């Protein structure tokens, strides 16, 4: 009977671990956007240099 | 170095049906053509 | 338990790597220099104009 | 394009008309591939590049137009088959920097693709898709590059941290 | 193989079905045997037999609740290997003979214990509402004790794999990358679900051509 609660806690742990994935995606989106913006800023800076 | 132009943001190749040529648009909002 | 510790370690690794790799603070220098260069350009170019 | 609901701006757009049928394809603000049917002005399908690749570094269409060729801001090259609606392959090479542009050359055929990006010194890297190697690499330099460095990068993973270049020689335009 | 639309009397011979995969419930030994548990003193009390899942196929007629087709059953390998067969089987009723009104049915008979072997039940439709028999194509199903059926999502993806068999416009490099799509269909094994009182099975019956059906 003691195994059951452990199983349930394992499931809750699975969901809690399943949230961090979407969290991580939402995170990395900002990194990608930062990369693109960095590229644009680089090009713009080159143009300013011209 | 007489020619003065900014970086080229866009370029396109074309044919005039007589002689071929290229067009270009820079980052300064200027366009030019070379045949 | 090793999986829970691996979860905490995963969140820790993700946050630490994300904070260390790009803090976005490095772009502020190039932004300031770019702004100053923009002022110098907007001044000198119009003046020469 | 504001009807997506997330209010995304169109990044790059490439349209094509086959004697069979005509359509268009575009990249979202989140760099998501969306092919809208030119006939019905409606969305046929929606493809999304993995977030591990950063953003979309370019846009190109296959000769049969059943496949999409897209670069990555992470400095990776990704060709995907729209037929089975999946990602065919993911490639990388050189200094592993951002890819300027990607396109399918004429004389090189559909079996080879031309991609500007990757290694710094290399101006344009042309690699044959099936061959998995770069046939012709045009580079600006006074010396020949390294063979081990020019070799195709595969085993590498998403763990790579993005390293670009802020130099004025980076951004450019090309038409072939 | 070629796809084409061919009506009942126009179509010639009898149907056949290849059957392959399933979905492990994980509630018992992987063969769905005995309902394993630490409480097994009760399993001795309940006299729970270890059942090795096998299958049987016969068609419910027309939804007129008559009986037409033949029950048929195959041999036994591990159902703890999840019994992946892709094994073909058939019966003696042609497509010309086949009434557009007709329905498939299946009963999974395991092998359990003394005078004991299990029984599970399912049913489905033969042809399309578009008259194409299962679109002469691959599919996947789900069934409970009663009043349950099949859907298409990942089975819709598998149905697109059947659209590869259904001859959408295709090329030779696309075929090599369809070997790479053998690698992709290999990657499709990642599927996961944990329902109960119901189960899933992967069953492909892709033919060459799209049937059609009518009266004689």
Curated annotation (Swiss-Prot), chain A:
Intracellular or extracellular location(s): Endosome membrane; Vacuole membrane; Preautophagosomal structure membrane
Top-level taxon of origin: Eukaryota
Other information: Present with 2490 molecules/cell in log phase SD medium.
Subunit structure of this chain's protein: Component of the autophagy-specific VPS34 PI3-kinase complex I composed of VPS15, VPS30, VPS34, ATG14 and ATG38; and of the VPS34 PI3-kinase complex II composed of VPS15, VPS30, VPS34 and VPS38.
Function: Required for cytoplasm to vacuole transport (Cvt), autophagy, nucleophagy, and mitophagy, as a part of the autophagy-specific VPS34 PI3-kinase complex I. This complex is essential to recruit the ATG8-phosphatidylinositol conjugate and the ATG12-ATG5 conjugate to the pre-autophagosomal structure. Also involved in endosome-to-Golgi retrograde transport as part of the VPS34 PI3-kinase complex II.
Family, similarity comment: Belongs to the beclin family.
Recorded domain comment: The C-terminal domain called the BARA domain is dispensable for the construction of both VPS34 PI3-kinase complexes, but is specifically required for autophagy through the targeting of complex I to the pre-autophagosomal structure.
Protein name, entry field: Vacuolar protein sorting-associated protein 30
Phylogenetic lineage: Eukaryota, Fungi, Dikarya, Ascomycota, Saccharomycotina
Whole sequence portion shown: 256 to 305 of 557
UniProtKB/Swiss-Prot annotation, chain B:
Domain comment as written in the entry: The WD region forms a seven-bladed propeller resembling that of typical G-beta subunits and is required to bind GPA1 and ATG14. Truncation of 30 residues from the C-terminus results in a temperature-conditional defect in protein sorting.
Record note on disruption phenotype: Decreases TORC1 activation in response to glutamine.
Description of how the protein assembles with itself and partners: Component of the autophagy-specific VPS34 PI3-kinase complex I composed of VPS15, VPS30, VPS34, ATG14 and ATG38; and of the VPS34 PI3-kinase complex II composed of VPS15, VPS30, VPS34 and VPS38. Interacts directly with ATG14 and GPA1. Interacts directly with VPS34.
Purpose: Serine/threonine-protein kinase required for cytoplasm to vacuole transport (Cvt) and autophagy as a part of the autophagy-specific VPS34 PI3-kinase complex I. This complex is essential to recruit the ATG8-phosphatidylinositol conjugate and the ATG12-ATG5 conjugate to the pre-autophagosomal structure. Is also involved in endosome-to-Golgi retrograde transport as part of the VPS34 PI3-kinase complex II.
Post-translational modification: Autophosphorylated.
Signal peptide: none
WD repeats: 3-35
Record's miscellaneous remark: Present with 279 molecules/cell in log phase SD medium.
Cellular localisation: Golgi apparatus, trans-Golgi network membrane; Endosome membrane
Protein's UniProt name: Serine/threonine-protein kinase VPS15
Protein family (similarity comment): Belongs to the protein kinase superfamily. Ser/Thr protein kinase family.
From Swiss-Prot, chain C:
Localisation per UniProt entry: Golgi apparatus, trans-Golgi network membrane; Endosome membrane
Record note on disruption phenotype: Abnormal reticulophagy.
Domain of life of the native organism: Eukaryota
Disulfide bonds: none
Misc: Present with 1070 molecules/cell in log phase SD medium.
Protein family according to the UniProt entry: Belongs to the VPS38 family.
Self-association state and partner proteins as the record states: Component of the VPS34 PI3-kinase complex II composed of VPS15, VPS30, VPS34 and VPS38.
Known role: Involved in endosome-to-Golgi retrograde transport as part of the VPS34 PI3-kinase complex II. This complex is required for the endosome-to-Golgi retrieval of PEP1 and KEX2, and the recruitment of VPS5 and VPS7, two components of the retromer complex, to endosomal membranes (probably through generating a specific pool of phosphatidylinositol 3-phosphate allowing the recruitment of the retromer complex proteins to the endosome). Mediates the interaction between VPS30 and the VPS34-VPS15 core complex, leading to the recruitment of VPS30 to the membrane.
Protein name: Vacuolar protein sorting-associated protein 38
Shown chain mapped onto the complete sequence: 246 to 294 of 439
Swiss-Prot record, chain E:
Cellular compartment(s): Golgi apparatus, trans-Golgi network membrane; Endosome membrane
Modifications the protein undergoes after translation, according to the UniProt entry: Autophosphorylated. Might also be phosphorylated by VPS15.
Residue ranges annotated for the C2 PI3K-type domain, each copy included: 11-185
Domain of life: Eukaryota
Phenotype upon gene inactivation: Abnormal localization of the peripheral membrane protein PIB2 to the vacuolar membrane. Decreases activation of TORC1 in response to glutamine.
Summary of subunit composition and partner proteins: Component of the autophagy-specific VPS34 PI3-kinase complex I composed of VPS15, VPS30, VPS34, ATG14 and ATG38, and of the VPS34 PI3-kinase complex II composed of VPS15, VPS30, VPS34 and VPS38. Interacts directly with ATG38. Interacts directly with VPS34.
Function (record text): Phosphatidylinositol 3-kinase required for cytoplasm to vacuole transport (Cvt) and autophagy as a part of the autophagy-specific VPS34 PI3-kinase complex I. This complex is essential to recruit the ATG8-phosphatidylinositol conjugate and the ATG12-ATG5 conjugate to the pre-autophagosomal structure. Also involved in endosome-to-Golgi retrograde transport as part of the VPS34 PI3-kinase complex II.
Family named by the database record: Belongs to the PI3/PI4-kinase family.
More details: Present with 1080 molecules/cell in log phase SD medium.
UniProt protein name: Phosphatidylinositol 3-kinase VPS34
Originating organism: Saccharomyces cerevisiae (strain ATCC 204508 / S288c) (Baker's yeast)
Residue numbers of the full-length protein present here: 4 to 219 of 875
